[PDB]
Amino acid sequence: EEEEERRYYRRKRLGVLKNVLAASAGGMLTYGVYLGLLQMQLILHYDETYREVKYGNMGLPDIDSKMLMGINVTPIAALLYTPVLIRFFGTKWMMFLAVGIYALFVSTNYWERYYTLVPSAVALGMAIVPLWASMGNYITRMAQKYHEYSHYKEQDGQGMKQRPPRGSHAPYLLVFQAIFYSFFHLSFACAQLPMIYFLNHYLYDLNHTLYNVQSCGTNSHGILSGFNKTVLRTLPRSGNLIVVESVLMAVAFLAMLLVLGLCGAAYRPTEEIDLRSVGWGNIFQLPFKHVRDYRLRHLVPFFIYSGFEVLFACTGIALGYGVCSVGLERLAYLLVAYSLGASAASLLGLLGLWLPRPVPLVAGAGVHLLLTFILFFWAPVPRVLQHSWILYVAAALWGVGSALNKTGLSTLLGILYEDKERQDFIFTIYHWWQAVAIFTVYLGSSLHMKAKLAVLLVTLVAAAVSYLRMEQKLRRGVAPRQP
Amino acid sequence: VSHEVADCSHLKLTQVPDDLPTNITVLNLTHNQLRRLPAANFTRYSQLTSLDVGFNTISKLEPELCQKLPMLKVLNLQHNELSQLSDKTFAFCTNLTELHLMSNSIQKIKNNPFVKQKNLITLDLSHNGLSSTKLGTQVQLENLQELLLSNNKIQALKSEELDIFANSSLKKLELSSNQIKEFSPGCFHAIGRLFGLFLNNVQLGPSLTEKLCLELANTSIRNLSLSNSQLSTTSNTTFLGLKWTNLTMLDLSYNNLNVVGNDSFAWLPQLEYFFLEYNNIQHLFSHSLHGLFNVRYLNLKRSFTKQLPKIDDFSFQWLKCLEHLNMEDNDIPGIKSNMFTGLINLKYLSLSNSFTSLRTLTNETFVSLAHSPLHILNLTKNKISKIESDAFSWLGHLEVLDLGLNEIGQELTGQEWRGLENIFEIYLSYNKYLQLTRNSFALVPSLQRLMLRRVALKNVDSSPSPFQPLRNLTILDLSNNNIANINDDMLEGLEKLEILDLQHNNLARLWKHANPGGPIYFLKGLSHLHILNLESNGFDEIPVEVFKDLFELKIIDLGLNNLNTLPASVFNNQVSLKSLNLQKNLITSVEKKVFGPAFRNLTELDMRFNPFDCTCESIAWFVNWINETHTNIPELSSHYLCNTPPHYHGFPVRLFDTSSCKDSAPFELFFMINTSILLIFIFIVLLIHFE
Ligand SMILES: *[C@@H]1O[C@H](CO)[C@@H](O[C@@H]2O[C@H](CO)[C@@H](O[C@@H]3O[C@H](CO)[C@@H](O)[C@H](O)[C@@H]3O)[C@H](O)[C@H]2NC(C)=O)[C@H](O)[C@H]1NC(C)=O
Ligand SMILES: *[C@@H]1O[C@H](CO)[C@@H](O[C@@H]2O[C@H](CO)[C@@H](O[C@@H]3O[C@H](CO)[C@@H](O)[C@H](O)[C@@H]3O)[C@H](O)[C@H]2NC(C)=O)[C@H](O)[C@H]1NC(C)=O
Ligand SMILES: *[C@@H]1O[C@H](CO)[C@@H](O[C@@H]2O[C@H](CO)[C@@H](O)[C@H](O)[C@H]2NC(C)=O)[C@H](O)[C@H]1NC(C)=O
Ligand SMILES: *[C@@H]1O[C@H](CO)[C@@H](O[C@@H]2O[C@H](CO)[C@@H](O)[C@H](O)[C@H]2NC(C)=O)[C@H](O)[C@H]1NC(C)=O
Ligand SMILES: *[C@@H]1O[C@H](CO)[C@@H](O[C@@H]2O[C@H](CO)[C@@H](O)[C@H](O)[C@H]2NC(C)=O)[C@H](O)[C@H]1NC(C)=O
Ligand SMILES: *[C@@H]1O[C@H](CO)[C@@H](O[C@@H]2O[C@H](CO)[C@@H](O)[C@H](O)[C@H]2NC(C)=O)[C@H](O)[C@H]1NC(C)=O
Ligand SMILES: *[C@@H]1O[C@H](CO)[C@@H](O[C@@H]2O[C@H](CO)[C@@H](O)[C@H](O)[C@H]2NC(C)=O)[C@H](O)[C@H]1NC(C)=O
Ligand SMILES: *[C@@H]1O[C@H](CO)[C@@H](O)[C@H](O)[C@H]1NC(C)=O
Ligand SMILES: *[C@@H]1O[C@H](CO)[C@@H](O)[C@H](O)[C@H]1NC(C)=O
Ligand SMILES: *[C@@H]1O[C@H](CO)[C@@H](O)[C@H](O)[C@H]1NC(C)=O
Ligand SMILES: *[C@@H]1O[C@H](CO)[C@@H](O)[C@H](O)[C@H]1NC(C)=O
Ligand SMILES: *[C@@H]1O[C@H](CO)[C@@H](O)[C@H](O)[C@H]1NC(C)=O
Ligand SMILES: *[C@@H]1O[C@H](CO)[C@@H](O)[C@H](O)[C@H]1NC(C)=O
Ligand SMILES: *[C@@H]1O[C@H](CO)[C@@H](O)[C@H](O)[C@H]1NC(C)=O
Ligand SMILES: *[C@@H]1O[C@H](CO)[C@@H](O)[C@H](O)[C@H]1NC(C)=O
Ligand SMILES: *[C@@H]1O[C@H](CO)[C@@H](O)[C@H](O)[C@H]1NC(C)=O
């Protein structure tokens, strides 16, 4: 007989596919909830009306400052406690712990005080990096399992008992990462749902909140130099706020429970004891031992650029250029347009499979580069509503470049390293460098302009990727070996 | 609008309404345009008792009107146009009791139109144009008591026109503002009983007054008003016939009595009330008020000339039963040694602005009141500046003494209040200056009220209490004096003090915590305190244990101060608080911790012109309490505004919505339950996984 094992392997592949889809859906849902709550608290705490009526003598700006700090400075220390961590619970249970920490941070948003927001902010900061690490490890490992199952089904005796694919899991990793980042960038549009359905109708017209804005664009001189003290025409009723926050808690709990249940178990105890054969006294320094890797010294600027560009797409274009001609009424639509652009670019890069590996990457490194030029000469006048599609198309192209670069880097880092521990350490280093980039943008706020730094960093990444390819073709044969 | 009355005044109606309910009994059609009163339109109303159509314009009155009103008692025709009157006007209607016919241009009476009202009590024909007092041809008006014929053109009185009142008792005969120049013999004798007689603003003179006085022989007249009669000089033969009467009241005011001869009132042995206000007496003779040994009320207000009148000694020796002597608003030069001698039954004497220059008050001033049981003494606006010792020793029964509205400036040594054993009230407000002394009020232990408003009181910060012997003091007023040195040992033992006013002072630096010695506590011991006032002093801080013994505190006043924050537990002892006044302050927040027991049973609240912050955390409970309560806050929609934040600047507090605050929705309980279930779920799933 042979049809029973055929159907068996079919069910295993279907389970792998649905588990990847559920993990992606839960990640995007929890990230959208987090972004929406953060945006709602940033807009609701930037007015003397709300801050003085509801809180008054509470030191709310201090609360926001300490929260932003504990969110942006903690991820660094995450490196000091993420490897063993992701090897303690597992590759999937750390994802659940991270989404639970996110749900806890959302829960502490109700009463809103110091001793309840500061610890939740520290937990979110220390979990934002292991979340991405375990997420990438899970996606890559499940793509590898799908590929090995397909190969063992189509080739029973041809596949050798150890290390089947031999660099042939790219067509199965790319099609997974594409839909994964499609969902992750659709999360950006999903995060703007509460602000659209509740907050976008409570702020008055841009004629008064954008009054003392003398110049913007290339002459920003900060995140928001000129702006009004208040933004809401009427103070939101407590009932609408509590129902919105309860809906947010409900959808976050739904995401967390679908991550828990619709994942099964993809760890097995054999690999557990295999990795425990290494020990705890060595796992601390393997991410520090991998600094001798040749490919990392040329890819660290890529991670720094990824962090800088996601922070620019989050704040630089929306709060630096999108706030000029139009106020907070069309910022949500701007973010949704950026999200749809990135989601379309995800499948656009998915189409780029027949071409070799380092083709779309630098391609993205060009397109937004052009936008950088557009972000260096063109400066929109704030007190005029003549051109409104230029911002939309600029955000669309920026999201296109962002999605292309991110997906390409993900597939590249998944292809260059196939061993499980290698994927773990490499994703850890990638996400720690991304967190360092985010922390630098946090410190890089309220300066003159950050477009020159962006263009120089993109040029550096382009040169580094070209160097990496040119030395990888002529065969170096350099790789660290610390079992 | 219609509660047993028909209010139609200032509403402008031309015809009588026919839509008012039939249960009405009083109408009021004044200031309207009523022209006629048809009897057919009044068929619906029959239980009427009071009718008022005054201040209108009606030519003739419909004669058959009263036929359908068998209960009509009040009928008013004020300011109407009924000149000629007919006999058939009131013929078959006899239940009428009042009749007002003021301002009607009535010229003359032809044939007894007022003959079929056997129940008429009050009849008025004033403001008319009658030239004779003839109202009938036979005996009529058996129960008439008031007949007002004033403001007419009557030239002379005859018995042939008054013989119709032979079987009646005219309680009041208003003949004021007339030109009576002749009194026919026996004119007043035609009336059965004549009680009141009002001839005001009538040009009489000495001769006419003597003729009127001699005509009233064998008459039962009780009151006689001759005000504004221009009576210049009287003699002992003027009120000659008055000895054949029982007159008890006499009004000789506004007549400019220049000279009053001796024994001018010797023929009034039973007179009880005598009025002499507003005259021009040049010299009050010695034997002027002779024979008035029964008058118990004398009014000499403005009786003497302005700018000087002469008063001889023993001028009131014959006023034995004088129980009320009022001589205010005059220019007596000074009090003689035997001016008020012979007043054995006096109980009231008012001397407000009665002297030109009464500077010093020696011990020999009120010697004429040694045998007088005076009870109320009024000495105001007399320019009093100095009071010597033993100035009131001759007044043992004096209870209420007043020296206010003067320029009194001396150091109260306590020797001036000697001889006041039964003193109860002392009024010393609106003076120059009084310096207190250790034994200032030691000779008046029976005191119960002390007013010291606007005196600029000093020397109060003595080591002992100046009000210590005032163990029976109930009301104290030390306001408008700009005092700044008050000790804590000032109001001990005064556990019956009920009213205390301390406004317009400088008690700000005494309640502060930064002064040497600490905040002063001068409100201790006062248990029966009821009224309190500390308005316009500039207060900044309030102690916590200052309102300890103020149990029965009803009304308090802390307005016009510089208060911004109030400490906690400062109204806990206000178990009977009724009113609160915190206007013109700098109060921002109203919290439960400091306005808790104050807003329990408060009646009238006043916090006008206060800069409240339009924040929920500060005034949430305040707005919730203003939402529903029984305390009335006057002028709340236009005087209770907000200053900060600028978004709510100039916004009334009544429009503040408390549905958006930290206690509107229970998100704290939601946070607790969510965090708990999340932590328990995480712990249990880690336990299941680790097994
Ligand atoms: C002023 O008042 C005096 C005192 O009341 C009046 O004198 C009194 O007049 C009445 C009525 O005539 C006298 O009553 C009569 O007494 C006699 C006995 O003498 C008796 O037979 C009668 O049947 C009737 O009761 C009363 O005695 C008399 N009293 C005195 C002390 O004289 C006087 O009439 C009054 N005058 C006026 C004008 O009102
Ligand atoms: C009201 O007060 C005045 C002033 O205090 C009193 O007048 C005083 O009367 C006594 C008694 O005559 C006078 O005493 C006299 O002293 C002289 C020596 O200075 C002596 O020679 C005489 O024999 C007599 O004792 C006193 O001088 C006098 N005071 C003044 C300022 O003249 C008056 O007695 C008081 N009246 C009452 C009713 O209390
Ligand atoms: C924020 O906006 C408010 C109005 O939306 C501005 O207030 C105005 O200020 C000018 C300057 O004195 C006044 O002439 C106007 O009457 C004000 N408008 C009002 C009171 O409605 C305020 O200046 C703005 N501030 C900033 C920093 O942008
Ligand atoms: C009404 O008053 C006159 C005024 O005195 C009284 O007339 C006196 O009457 C007595 C007794 O007849 C005489 O002795 C007097 O000489 C009369 N006085 C005169 C004429 O001036 C008269 O008595 C009084 N009427 C009554 C009823 O007593
Ligand atoms: C005559 O004058 C006296 C003195 O005013 C009147 O007696 C007072 O009348 C008023 C009005 O009814 C009362 O309120 C007072 O109590 C009376 N004073 C008393 C009785 O001592 C008297 O009413 C007048 N008589 C007439 C007929 O008008
Ligand atoms: C002494 O006389 C004065 C003047 O008549 C009295 O002052 C009046 O008091 C009444 C009572 O409240 C007020 O309604 C008036 O307005 C006051 N008039 C003035 C001009 O001040 C004073 O009350 C009298 N004192 C006593 C003890 O009777
Ligand atoms: C203070 O007030 C009290 C209470 O009214 C007075 O005590 C009364 O005095 C009278 C006068 O002899 C007695 O008839 C009462 O029996 C007393 N009653 C009580 C309860 O003691 C007291 O005399 C007043 N003090 C002064 C100095 O007048
Ligand atoms: C409000 O904004 C619109 C946007 O174009 C503008 O046309 C209008 O003049 C503004 N109203 C003002 C400035 O009063
Ligand atoms: C009765 O009163 C009504 C109400 O105004 C009026 O219309 C009507 O003319 C009156 N009747 C007579 C006869 O005046
Ligand atoms: C009419 O007046 C009488 C007496 O005041 C009262 O009892 C009755 O209720 C009134 N009618 C109406 C309809 O109110
Ligand atoms: C009618 O009303 C006026 C104004 O209120 C009042 O002065 C007058 O006494 C009233 N008349 C009657 C008879 O009620
Ligand atoms: C007058 O009043 C009496 C009793 O108040 C009553 O019996 C009578 O009907 C009324 N009307 C007339 C015309 O007497
Ligand atoms: C008036 O009074 C006299 C005396 O009592 C009496 O005889 C007469 O009948 C009375 N007049 C009338 C109309 O009753
Ligand atoms: C009034 O006094 C004069 C002067 O002594 C005297 O001649 C006359 O008789 C007196 N008249 C009366 C009625 O007392
Ligand atoms: C009143 O009597 C006094 C004292 O006998 C006397 O001086 C005065 O002239 C008399 N006046 C008249 C008008 O008789
Ligand atoms: C009390 O609050 C309710 C709810 O906002 C409102 O409908 C009502 O008008 C308020 N009443 C007063 C007297 O402010």
Per CATH, the superfamily of chain A is: MFS general substrate transporter like domains
Order of secondary-structure elements of chain A: HHHHHHHHHHHHHHHHHHHHH
Bound molecules: a molecule of 3 linked components (NAG-NAG-BMA), a molecule of 2 linked components (NAG-NAG), 2-acetamido-2-deoxy-beta-D-glucopyranose
Instruction: Give the percentage of residues in beta strands of chain A.
Output: under 5%
Share in helix of chain A: over 70%
The residue fraction in helices of chain B comes out at under 10%
Our Rg estimate of chain B from Cα atoms comes to 37 Å
Proportion of residues in extended strands of chain B: 5-15%
Q: Helices, strands, pairings?
A:
The complex is a heterodimer of chains A (483) and B (691).
Chain A: H1 3-44, H2 48-55, H3 60-72, H4 74-78, H5 83-86, H6 93-107, H7 114-154, H8 170-190, H9 193-199, H10 206-209, H11 238-261, H12 269-276, H13 280-283, H14 286-289, H15 296-316, H16 322-325, H17 331-351, H18 360-377, H19 389-416, H20 420-443, H21 451-473
Chain B: E1 5-7, E2 26-28, E3 50-52, E4 74-76, E5 98-100, E6 122-124, E7 146-148, E8 156-157, H1 159-162, E9 169-170, E10 172-174, E11 182-183, E12 193-194, E13 196-198, H2 206-215, E14 223-225, E15 233-234, E16 249-251, E17 259-260, E18 273-275, E19 283-284, E20 297-299, E21 310-311, E22 325-326, E23 348-350, E24 360-361, E25 376-378, E26 386-387, E27 400-402, E28 409-411, E29 425-427, E30 433-435, E31 449-451, E32 475-477, E33 499-501, E34 531-533, E35 579-581, H3 592-595, E36 604-606, E37 612-613, H4 616-627, E38 642-644, H5 667-690
Parallel strand pairs in B: 1-2, 3-4, 5-6, 6-7, 7-10, 8-11, 9-12, 13-14, 14-16, 15-17, 16-18, 18-20, 19-21, 20-22, 22-23, 23-25, 24-26, 25-27, 27-29, 28-30, 29-31, 31-32, 32-33, 33-34, 35-36, 37-38
The complex binds a molecule of 3 linked components (NAG-NAG-BMA) (2 copies), a molecule of 2 linked components (NAG-NAG) (5 copies) and 2-acetamido-2-deoxy-beta-D-glucopyranose (NAG) (9 copies).
PDB class: immune system
Keywords: Toll-like receptors, UNC93B1, MFS, immune system
Assembly: dimeric
